[PDB]
Design a protein around this nucleic acid. Structure first.
Ligand SMILES: [Mg+2]
Ligand SMILES: [Mg+2]
Ligand SMILES: [Mg+2]
Ligand SMILES: [Mg+2]
Lengths: 56, 291, 208
RNA sequence: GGACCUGGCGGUGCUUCAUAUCCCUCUAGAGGAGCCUGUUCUGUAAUCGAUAAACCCCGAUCAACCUCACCACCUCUUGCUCAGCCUAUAUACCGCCAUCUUAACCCUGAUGAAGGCUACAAAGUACGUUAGGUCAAGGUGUAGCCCAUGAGGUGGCAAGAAAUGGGCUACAUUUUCUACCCCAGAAAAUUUAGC
């Protein structure tokens, strides 16, 4: 599925309150997600079947 | 492909999962229904996806897998239907029945079925010419003195979609504390929203936000717009109006008041006058708005 | 368009609905019965069932607006009508007995006759071939010449040679000139009628 | 040599209409003045070349004695620090943008080439690519000069003319100022859209 299905057919891999109206620290959560994904893809090489789901 | 043992196993899996969901939700498993299943799955697995199909679903296996594979002969190989070898046993059986009824009669806001719906009911693909032939036979049956059974048989093929009447639902008549009859109605034009109360009897006094109309509307165009509904039905000076308009600008407010007053006035005119107002554009919400 | 194709334009005529059912021919009766099943567009701001409504003056006012300023254009139109009325009253009072019968004081009659006296019957339509846009005389449609009369009057009144004379005063003077078949707009009609008589070579091209 | 079959003319015109895209017709605005840019010609030893690097802070600005770039002369240098330089290269890769390329069965003809429709029905049914751009909101390498592609000093350099391409300002009587937010008083040729 293509990017224009993110709220129609797909969902969001990461789920956090940062991007809600009135909340803060969206950038810090984004950088955290970036590091988690690279770290996990480097620590489980060839094991991950799909993308991670990061819940908070 | 889906084998019959495969779907059998999905049937026991669905039944056991249904009993489990009844356990989880505290409902009685015996009476636990499919609407209950849908509600419980919506609660337990919330999903805001716009596509209803993409949302999590727990259906009976028969509702998921199509399996339109009907057996037309038994173990001995003999077909069940005597018209099997035509290849269109259902369609030709129906034509045979219709011809029999035509022979019997000869001895003595709705629509014809569409082709693909006729296919759905006959569960067999059929061409356009044979569909026309069937419809022609049905018309011939209608032309003859069809009895109750034949009328019901044709009604099996008759859909009720055709025709729709634009009648302009009238507002009810309310009565105020003083005993006067009035009717209330609403209108909208651009961002202006208006609500008008039209009294049955009056002297032609219009009050906009508690202000006289000629003071509230300095521009003559707005006053002509407010005059239009009452003049069109020749009852100027016979009703009192108390309206409230908010938002928009001068012309949008005038138009919204015009619409609200026309819709409220529809209570005190004859249905012919209501239809004349509709045909004059006085009862239609103008949908033109900025990009 | 925000209206669906099935929506039909409304009919604001008020005496139309008061015709007795007896007069209605079968075709008109069928039309009336058909109108009940259709959706009708909301009546636009503008035309009204009023007895003083005049579509020609409405169109002239719309052709005078600049930047959507309808209040100002209507103000100018009413000022012009009042100026014509007052001028005619002045000329009527100062006239002797036998000239008072031939002085018009209705401004609407003067406006309509002035615009009628300026309508051109024939005009030129260019047609393209060979790199030469061929100018053929053409009989103008009624709508076209009605538009041209109004456009010529307005453009004549918008000329910059008329310094600090206000638009109602210029327009009433031009209207009263055109009423008597005089002025520059009548000459603009004549200089098109003669300049189309000067090009009657291609006078029979009937497929413009 | 005889018979037959498929062809090939992405051919050519002519007839009628469906004839939507595309056309015109039609409607409403857009040329002057003053500055700034694009191209040419002429001219200089030379650049009317640029400011994460000047000045002006009402806005914006020209050349500023900023500084860098260029021309004519000179000086250093084992020096800043195993120094120093947006010097080159994505025509090194990676990122980002863009270009282009990407059947079967059944019948008929003598089981020849071959052919298969009629509805009141007569065999028909089923990723790569690129001397591509981007080193300004991003990276990993590779090479250059290293008595000079580094660091300084002394003078200059500050162009001229058009025809045309483009941009910014003010441009009014249907105007301008005040009070009000609409009944007052004073002043004076192509092109862009259309729906
Ligand atoms: Mg340097
Ligand atoms: Mg550089
Ligand atoms: Mg390249
Ligand atoms: Mg210089």
């Amino acid at each position: 599925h293509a990017p224009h299905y993110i709220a129609h057919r797909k969902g969001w891999l990461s789920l956090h309150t940062g991007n809600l109206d009135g909340e803060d620290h969206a950038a810090e959560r984004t950088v955290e997600d970036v590091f988690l994904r690279k770290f996990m893809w480097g620590t489980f090489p060839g094991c991950l079947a799909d993308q991670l789901v990061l819940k908070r | 492909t889906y084998t019959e043992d495969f779907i059998k196993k999905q049937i026991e899996e669905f039944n056991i999962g249904k009993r489990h969901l009844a356990n989880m939700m505290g409902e009685d498993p015996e009476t636990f229904t499919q609407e209950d299943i849908d509600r419980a799955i919506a609660y337990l697995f919330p999903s805001g996806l716009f596509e209803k199909r993409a949302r999590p679903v727990m259906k009976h296996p028969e509702q998921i897998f199509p399996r339109q594979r009907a057996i037309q002969w038994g173990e001995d190989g003999r077909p069940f239907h005597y018209l099997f070898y035509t290849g269109k046993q259902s369609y030709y059986s129906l034509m045979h029945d219709v011809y029999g009824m035509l022979l019997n009669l000869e001895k003595h806001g709705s629509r014809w079925l569409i082709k693909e719906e006729l296919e759905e009911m006959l569960v067999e693909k059929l061409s356009d010419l044979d569909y026309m032939q069937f419809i022609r036979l049905l018309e011939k049956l209608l032309t003859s003195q069809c009895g109750a059974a034949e009328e019901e048989f044709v009604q099996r093929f008759r859909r009720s979609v055709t025709l729709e009447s634009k009648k302009q639902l009238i507002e009810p008549v309310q009565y105020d504390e003083q005993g006067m009859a009035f009717s209330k109605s609403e209108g909208k034009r651009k961002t202006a929203k208006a609500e008008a109360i039209v009294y049955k009897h009056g002297s032609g006094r219009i009050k906009v936000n508690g202000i006289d109309y000629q003071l509230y509307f300095p521009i003559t165009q707005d006053r002509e717009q407010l005059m239009f509904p009452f003049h069109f039905v020749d009852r100027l000076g016979k009703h009192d109006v108390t309206c409230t308009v908010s938002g928009g600008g001068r012309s949008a407010q005038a138009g919204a008041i015009r619409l609200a007053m026309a819709k409220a006035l529809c209570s005190f005119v004859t249905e012919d006058e209501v239809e004349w107002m509709r045909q004059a554009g006085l009862l239609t919400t103008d949908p033109r708005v900025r990009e | 368009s925000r209206y669906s194709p099935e929506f039909k334009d409304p009919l604001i005529d008020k005496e139309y609905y008061r015709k007795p059912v007896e007069e209605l021919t079968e075709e008109e009766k069928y039309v009336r019965e058909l109108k009940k099943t259709q959706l009708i567009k909301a009546a636009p701001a503008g035309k009204t069932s009023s007895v003083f409504e005049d579509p020609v003056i409405s169109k002239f006012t719309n052709m005078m607006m600049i930047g959507g300023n309808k209040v100002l254009a209507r103000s100018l139109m009413i000022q012009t009508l009042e100026a014509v009325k007052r001028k005619q009253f002045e000329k009527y009072h100062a006239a002797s007995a036998e000239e008072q019968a031939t002085i018009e004081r209705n401004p609407y009659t003067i406006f309509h006759q002035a615009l009628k006296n300026c309508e051109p019957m024939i005009g030129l339509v260019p047609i393209l071939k060979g790199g030469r846009f061929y100018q053929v005389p053409v009989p103008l449609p009624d709508r076209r010449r009605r538009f041209l009369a109004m456009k010529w009057m307005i453009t004549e009144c918008r000329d910059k040679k008329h310094q600090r004379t206000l638009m109602p005063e210029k327009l009433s003077h031009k209207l009263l000139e055109a009423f008597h078949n005089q002025g520059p707009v009548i000459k603009r009609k004549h200089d098109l009628h003669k300049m189309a008589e000067a090009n009657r070579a291609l006078a029979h091209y009937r497929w413009w």
